[PDB]
């Protein structure tokens, strides 16, 4: 922790090569413009929000890159990367708009999408897919998520894939942000990687939401403290020009001492009352200071702005930041939050108006108009020159990759298709898929395995020898290992898999990690990442509530799949076997990186578990991407029912299939689903239509399509309502669903398939039940399965012990 | 960062306190006791898991607390919380057999728990109730969640409620856990609170499960960058003593020297090679360095060890940490990962019974037998004597908390059960049933409202000016700030959550932020909770897909239900009316404080939206409760349906039916559906009991003792699926449900019930299209509505939108 001052000293500030005149009266009208599109959206009062203060307290750093930093996406790369402040967009509109990018008519649809000529509040891909690019609204995750991308940029350069050099990646957060743990608890890794191609800009206004973030600390010195034992190179932008003259004569560094000493809520205290209050409370604590401005006059204490506001400031820092070398750069920009607002943060439109000398006359002023600079005009010129010279505009997006990918076939996946000799799991069988993929030649090394520590446990150490580990184990290893560290894995697959559209260079990531810790312990990037259009595969390993046996608890599983349907677009699998993990594989590739370019990710749970592996049906494929198929049909002459499986509790319905047969003479129709979700989903939109279209002839659910309606029976290793809600399609009038509610334990997986009520033994009692209050067979039968099977009828409930 | 050598000097070193050669004897039985655990699961061959090594590393760490330093629960506090490394419990669990309070059968079913008398794979309180007190395996919690305990630690002693002044809050974490952004994420937040409670032991053995945690790098060094830069106080444990006269002598500075410059990879090379390779690579660096060796055997030379395997120099470390004031400590223990157990790292473990010097004969080595100690003898007399001066054993956990609340009664909430004269929301009405609370003498001070930042958007400020903010706003401030940081916010709230049981001091903590933010979010946290037995309320602001309409992609919340609804011990509620939020406010309070003291934690979603609140129904109560009651029935003629919704959205279900009454003729049943989750979850609860008792009379599902066969619609604020989950439990042959199934988007809120399909619109045409396909109306009818309405039946589905 340095003194209280500027880092970069004026003697070492590089010359300002813009026309700071000039990029003011532009900048003025972004202001302006900003502040109509707000407040033209507060005017129709249907509570649609949006700020303003911040912006305000910002534009000018932003301003400075835009006007001499930010290089848009070109020929050779994808340009810079800015994870823009979410809160800050009216700004941003505000500047397309006037480089003639954005329309009135859009800036008046500021935060009303729905009919479709619109801005989203905040940046969302999802919502504007050639506009925005990164989703950073969610505090926190933009960091971290800039981090990763810095990386991968690396990574794309190291693997002699694509030549990134000339990209920066830029992270805009706010200082309140920073206390979000996954601002800061992820810096140590910039620089062991020693990522130069980062800069992380901390507005820091000393000010959140609700209040200051540390009122009785100094937040600018725990931040450079932190950042700075990180190994980070610091820079702080405390103050502007007009205290240069003030410290290079202030000989007794009782000034420095004076700064070093006050802190935030009073540096705050100071912004509201004027250069009285100032001189008086603040310069006039010593005599070596008093004695500064003793003889200045009160308006021009007031006139000492902070450094945030300074464009020379500015500029010497991004420049500073831009020459280093070896590790990441952090700028701590001190600003005034509500900058020039008086009053608040048509009198105040009218203030304003003034403070920034906006071209609006008392005439136009109640109009809310907002400002244009015609072609030929000074302003026009410039503007867009700076741009010119920087390839363009930003932010902008490209939703499609240009090149023609030639995408392995599923016939290349045959051996996985046919009867495995050894007992093998859905794991081994996703490895082996990958081993496909990576002997294609168009996308051999487009793919990027990723781990968090764990490789042994999902059986990837093989590939290690082939395609080796990515560690600038050298620079041009593929896989990327990212230690215990589930967040950061996440954000590597992100940028990996947004990289089609970042830099028109399509990599397929799979992540591979404990299925426990994907949705639930990083779920809130995962939404993000569907908002980002991620074009990728998420591998839920060791999953299944009994499957993971002696883990227990904290890592059994029975659950990710109702928080992976909660993301629209991301496409959940639960499969079975081998040749359903290779049929859905390749079915994502084909959609997601084949000509359809299918905006959606997927989601696929593997296990742990190994067992006889069967050839797929002739025939099968399209069923087993739909979501259902049905394995097989057994007779049996004293009652018929339908029996549905998934995942490693498929190989149990199918035991309960035999002992209904053997047993009882119930026949039935098997069942394989590799996908509920996919199945509720195709059920959902037949609904929909059908309730859309009264005087039409329903449609009907493929579920609906591929079962019958005798009794049925569905079981898993996840809680019941993953099998439940497709309930509404099932054409069966009974239709019983076991499932693994409640939490984990350590034990065999015998023992727990039958302490959840999974195993065969109650799918057969379940099946018989149905069939006995049908009439088929006598309750008395039911109650004897039960004596039968050891099963223990008043244990208390699964979701309960 | 400092030189790679201890922090603490020979010369500053306290003698040791206890009986070392003792200490050794009864640690070495413990050693084996947890290797024999272990292997013996191993036997069964049931895939059961456990691991070894790691414990190996820090056995003489967790020893020297045991006996001088860990204080266990007592009359005056709970003793100091420990937060175990979670992998490291077959020691602790050794430790407790050999203190006599497991058996040996126990041991003999470590993680084989289903049948009762067994011991869970790692620390799971819900698992082991009178046991486990912090569930630290899923990594990254264990550290965050110390932190803020600590803080609370100090909170309920400023607050005058409890001087824990006497506890120290200990959080175990291992090197490659420390990659986990939630582990240093925070850290900043121990220094801004002073929490010279808290004490971090981080097992530097340098590796995580896959390999070295940095092998090119010092993650020592980056480790105490990172918490230096933060202000902790750092405590380097590096070596043992037999390097203390090697560095006296070294004059030159040489070895220091070499010390610094080694890195991680290295460092553990040298640890799997001889006394030889050592000499030559490491000391053979340097002319000086191979002079201070010279004299050496290769075998003295192989003796040197890492610090954290001493106990002289541990002990000097925790001692120091104890005296430390205003900052918190944190130990890097330097270990050797797998220590003593040789290349491994039946008899090949008489290969650590030699090394420890362990009592069983070679001979029996094979029956893997568990060593005691007789009463009588030395071993077991220091073992209780350590023990008991630090008052007991540990870990050790109280279920319920001893004293009795005089709780509010439900007719303390009576002004929010009657007609609100101004339109409020269901915030509005929370807040309200908050300030009852703080009008009760029992419970009054044990309230813990939590916010994140995020005051005035929930209006909470009011609250301010009464109770204050805790700021050590001052010390005596009862409402807990936490900033722009939900992971801190929640582990806040955990911390009151449990302290009924972890100090019998029980608190009622609520807090309140945006519902996007809950789950989504701090998921991990969630679930860890539940094993915590967690008892609190969760609020979850600002919900619902359409209602928080200007916030758009990543704010607007139309699953946060999904995920709550996957914790078996979550309470999920949904109200629509003020006096619903009083009645379930009221009921929590009663199951979790009260007499019953049920372990469970609450959820409730609460709105941003102003509307008119009615009185409650007489006799609504239970309905309310259980989570569904009739609100009124509607006559008409030509049709009869049922009607259901559900927060935001029940307004708009009821104006629907009025609509199908005055233009359609069709009457209806009206319910307010305050929770779908508790309906399924006692619908399942039905169907699971009468499935096991065929002969017995059916359970009949609570929703279907409130519902009738009349054809029904539901629609709510969120997915489908929140409604569709009661499917099977509805008495109705149709049950068609609307939701908000997709991506939200910014615009009114008119807009966005259209677009998402929920509307009153949407609710009327559904329920005609239901009465059409009985003949009851005429398909014309219903499309006529469809035309009437502006819905366009073609519009792309909102889940794909
Ligand atoms: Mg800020
Ligand atoms: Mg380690």
Same mark, same amino acid.
């Given at each position: ?12 500030? /590089?010359?300002? /090569?813009?026309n700071?005149?000039l +990029?003011?009266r532009?900048?003025?009208?972004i202001? %302006?413009?900003?502040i ?16 303003m203060?911040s912006?305000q ?14 290089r ?6 994808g ?10 967009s009216?700004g ?6 006037? +480089? ?7 800036l ?20 504007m ?17 800039? *981090?990763?991308?810095?990386?991968f940029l ?5 693997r002699?894939?694509k ?5 920066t ?32 800009? *901390?507005?820091?206004?000393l ?6 973030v540390?009122?009785?600390?100094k ?11 990180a190994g ?5 932008v405390?103050?502007?020009?007009r %205290?240069?003259?003030?410290l ?25 009352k ?11 604590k ?7 401005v ?6 021009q204490? %007031?006139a ?12 010497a820092?991004?420049?500073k ?25 048509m ?7 003034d ?8 005439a136009?002023?109640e109009?809310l ?15 867009? &020159? ?11 997006r ?5 090149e023609?990918? +030639? ?9 996985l ?10 794991t ?6 990958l081993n ?35 560690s600038p ?26 990289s089609?559209?970042t830099?028109?260079? /399509? ?12 949705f ?6 995962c939404w ?9 595969f998420?591998?839920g390993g060791?999953?299944?509530?009994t499957?993971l046996?002696?883990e227990?608890?904290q890592?059994?599983?029975?659950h990710?799949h109702i ?20 049929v ?22 593997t296990?742990?578990?190994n ?12 069923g087993?991407?739909?979501g ?7 007779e ?7 029996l549905?499986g998934?995942?490693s ?6 035991? &309960? ?15 394989s689903?590799?996908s509920?979700t ?19 002839t329903?449609?009907?659910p ?7 309606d005798?009794?049925?029976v569905?079981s898993?290793d ?15 009038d ?16 015998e ?8 195993? &065969? ?35 208390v ?5």
């Amino acid at each position: 922790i340095s003194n209280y001052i500027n880092t970069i000293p004026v003697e070492e500030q /590089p010359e300002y /090569p813009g026309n700071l005149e000039l +990029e003011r009266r532009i900048r003025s009208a972004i202001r %302006w413009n900003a502040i109509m599109t707000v407040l033209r959206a507060s005017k129709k009062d249907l509570e649609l929000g949006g700020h303003m203060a911040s912006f305000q307290s910002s534009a000018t750093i932003y301003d400075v890159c835009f006007n001499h930093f930010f290089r848009a996406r070109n020929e050779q790369d994808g340009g810079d990367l800015v994870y823009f402040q979410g809160h800050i967009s009216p700004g941003v509109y505000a500047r397309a708009f006037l +480089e003639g990018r954005l329309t009135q008519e859009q800036l008046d649809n500021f935060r009303q999408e729905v009919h479709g000529n619109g801005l989203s509040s905040y940046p969302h891909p999802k919502l504007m897919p050639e506009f925005w690019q990164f989703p950073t609204v969610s505090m926190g995750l933009g960091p971290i998520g800039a *981090i990763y991308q810095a990386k991968f940029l690396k990574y794309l350069e190291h693997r002699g894939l694509k030549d990134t050099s000339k990209q920066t990646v830029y992270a805009f957060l706010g200082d309140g942000e920073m206390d979000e743990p996954e601002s800061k608890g992820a810096i140590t890794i910039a620089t062991r990687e020693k990522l130069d191609n980062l800069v992380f800009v *901390i507005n820091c206004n000393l000010q959140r939401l609700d209040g200051p973030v540390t009122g009785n600390g100094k937040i600018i010195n725990e931040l450079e403290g932190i950042f700075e034992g990180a190994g980070w190179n610091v820079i702080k932008v405390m103050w502007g020009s007009r %205290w240069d003259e003030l410290l290079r004569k202030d000989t007794s560094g009782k000034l420095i001492q004076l700064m070093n000493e006050t802190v935030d809520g009073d540096y705050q205290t100071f912004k509201s009352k004027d250069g009285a209050y100032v001189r008086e409370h603040f310069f006039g604590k010593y005599p070596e200071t008093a004695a500064l401005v003793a003889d200045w006059t009160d308006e021009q204490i %007031w006139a000492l702005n902070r450094g945030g506001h300074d464009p020379k400031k500015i500029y010497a820092a991004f420049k500073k930041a831009q020459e280093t070398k070896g590790k990441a750069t952090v700028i701590l920009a001190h600003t005034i939050k509500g900058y020039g607002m008086g009053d608040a943060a048509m009198d105040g439109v009218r203030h304003i108006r003034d403070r920034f000398n906006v071209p609006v006359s008392d005439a136009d002023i109640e109009k809310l108009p907002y400002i244009t600079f015609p072609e030929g005009s000074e302003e026009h010129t410039y503007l867009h &020159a700076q741009r010119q010279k920087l390839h363009g505009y930003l932010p902008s997006r490209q939703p499609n990759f240009t090149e023609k990918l +030639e995408l392995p076939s599923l016939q290349d996946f045959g051996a996985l298709l046919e009867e495995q000799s050894k007992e093998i799991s859905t794991t081994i069988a996703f490895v082996r898929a990958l081993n496909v993929m990576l002997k294609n030649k168009s996308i051999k090394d487009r793919l990027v395995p990723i781990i968090a520590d764990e490789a042994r446990t999902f059986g990837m150490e093989g590939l290690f020898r082939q395609i080796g580990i990515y560690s600038p184990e050298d620079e041009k290893g593929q896989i990327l290992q990212e230690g215990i560290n589930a967040l950061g894995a996440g954000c590597s697959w992100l940028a990996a898999a947004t990289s089609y559209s970042t830099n028109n260079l /399509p990599m397929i990531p799979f992540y591979i990690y404990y299925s426990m810790f994907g949705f639930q312990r990083i779920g809130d990037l995962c939404w993000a990442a569907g908002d980002q259009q991620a074009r990728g595969f998420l591998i839920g390993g060791t999953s299944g509530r009994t499957t993971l046996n002696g883990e227990g608890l904290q890592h059994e599983d029975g659950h990710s799949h109702i928080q992976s349907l909660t993301i629209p677009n991301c496409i959940s699998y639960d499969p079975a076997y081998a040749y359903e993990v290779a049929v859905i594989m390749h079915d994502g590739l084909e959609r997601m990186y084949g000509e359809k370019q299918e905006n959606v990710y997927y989601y696929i749970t593997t296990l742990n578990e190994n067992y006889h592996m069967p050839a797929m049906p002739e025939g099968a494929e399209e069923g087993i991407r739909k979501g259902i198929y049905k394995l097989e049909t057994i007779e049996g002459s004293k009652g018929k029912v339908q029996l549905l499986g998934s995942g490693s509790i498929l190989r149990h319905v199918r035991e &309960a299939a035999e002992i209904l047969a053997k047993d009882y003479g119930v026949g039935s129709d098997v069942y394989s689903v590799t996908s509920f979700t996919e199945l509720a989903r195709d059920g959902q939109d037949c609904e929909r239509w059908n309730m859309l279209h009264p005087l039409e002839t329903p449609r009907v659910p493929y579920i609906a399509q591929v079962m019958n309606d005798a009794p049925a029976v569905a079981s898993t290793d996840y809680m019941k309502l993953f099998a439940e809600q497709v309930r509404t399609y099932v054409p069966a009038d009974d239709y019983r669903v076991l499932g693994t509610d409640g939490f984990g334990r350590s034990d065999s997986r015998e023992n727990l398939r039958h302490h959840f009520e999974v195993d &065969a033994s109650y799918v057969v009692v379940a099946a018989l039940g149905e069939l006995a209050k049908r009439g088929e067979i006598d309750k008395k039968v039911v109650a004897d399965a039960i004596a039968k099977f050891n099963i223990d009828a008043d244990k208390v409930n699964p979701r309960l012990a």
